[PDB]
Amino acid sequence: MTMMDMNFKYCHKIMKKHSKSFSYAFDLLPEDQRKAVWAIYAVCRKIDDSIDDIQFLNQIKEDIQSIEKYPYEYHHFQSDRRIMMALQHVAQHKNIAFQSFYNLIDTVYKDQHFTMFETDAELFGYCYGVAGTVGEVLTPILSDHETHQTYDVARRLGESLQLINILRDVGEDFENERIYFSKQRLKQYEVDIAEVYQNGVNNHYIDLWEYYAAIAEKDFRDVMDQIKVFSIEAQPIIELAARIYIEILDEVRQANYTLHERVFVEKRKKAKLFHEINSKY
Numbered sequence: 001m002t003m004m005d006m007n008f009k010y011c012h013k014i015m016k017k018h019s020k021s022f023s024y025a026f027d028l029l030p031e032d033q034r035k036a037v038w039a040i041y042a043v044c045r046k047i048d049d050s051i052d053d054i055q056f057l058n059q060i061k062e063d064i065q066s067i068e069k070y071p072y073e074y075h076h077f078q079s080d081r082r083i084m085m086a087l088q089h090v091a092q093h094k095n096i097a098f099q100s101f102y103n104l105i106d107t108v109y110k111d112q113h114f115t116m117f118e119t120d121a122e123l124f125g126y127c128y129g130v131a132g133t134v135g136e137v138l139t140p141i142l143s144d145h146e147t148h149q150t151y152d153v154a155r156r157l158g159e160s161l162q163l164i165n166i167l168r169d170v171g172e173d174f175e176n177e178r179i180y181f182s183k184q185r186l187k188q189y190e191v192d193i194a195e196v197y198q199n200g201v202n203n204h205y206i207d208l209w210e211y212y213a214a215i216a217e218k219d220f221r222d223v224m225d226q227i228k229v230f231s232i233e234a235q236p237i238i239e240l241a242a243r244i245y246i247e248i249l250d251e252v253r254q255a256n257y258t259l260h261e262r263v264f265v266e267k268r269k270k271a272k273l274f275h276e277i278n279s280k281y
């Protein structure tokens, strides 16, 4: 094991720790591609966590800026050195959309003084900053020749996964004093998340939840229809990652939309999905 390997293996640990699903899918990529993904994932995970004040965040940001400006110089990274070395090594061979990390970093900064979304258009803006940006950074890894269509599809996939994540985590987020459903849509469907956390699901809530789930499902179908924008090796894997995340919607439904635990797709169910897709390819 060279030193860079240990850097990547650390990246890998972070990704697996955070997301059993994406790990399960993206570890199936060829070596070169999966290691790039681990590294991009780890950076983004670290940015997601950096607050816990903004000092570590500013350090990650400066690290990323050094890499962009001086891809081939040795840096003394201020933040997490194993992660940034791996990102640097990625950027020496692929085209990183640096503005997409900055967009993510700005969104994390802002989430500091979070106030509920007035409308869905703000909510979908947040899904872009926290996740669409991530799909954009991955685009060169996952496709042979990047065009605007490839970015578009990857950005939609990211935003959709983010919205599914929001749908899974309503109760956990409410505990951490966050609600991501828009005020407009909460008022329209007659829902009060505090009330629902207290007394359980009713029909208004289910209707509201299902309004957003149908958006997530439509976007997912639109992505699957355009899956050819990606490299042949990544196609089945992106289809796996998406199907696994999507299934989360059916898990929520089966737990009657509970606000009191995180539902999950069993590892054994992941393997079933892989089989179904492996055999279409």
Ligand SMILES: CC(C)=CCC/C(C)=C\CNCCN[C@H]1[C@@H]2C[C@H]3C[C@@H](C2)C[C@@H]1C3
Pocket: 022, 041, 044, 045, 046, 048, 130, 131, 132, 134, 135, 138, 154, 157, 158, 161, 162, 165, 241
């Ligand atoms: C797999 C494609 C195309 C995009 C990624 C999908 C996606 C960013 C999130 C969905 N699951 C929650 C992850 N939210 C993201 C933010 C917080 C963690 C660190 C960064 C920023 C990456 C993700 C985890």
Ligand SMILES: [Mg+2]
Pocket: 048, 108, 111, 130
């Ligand atoms: Mg966040």
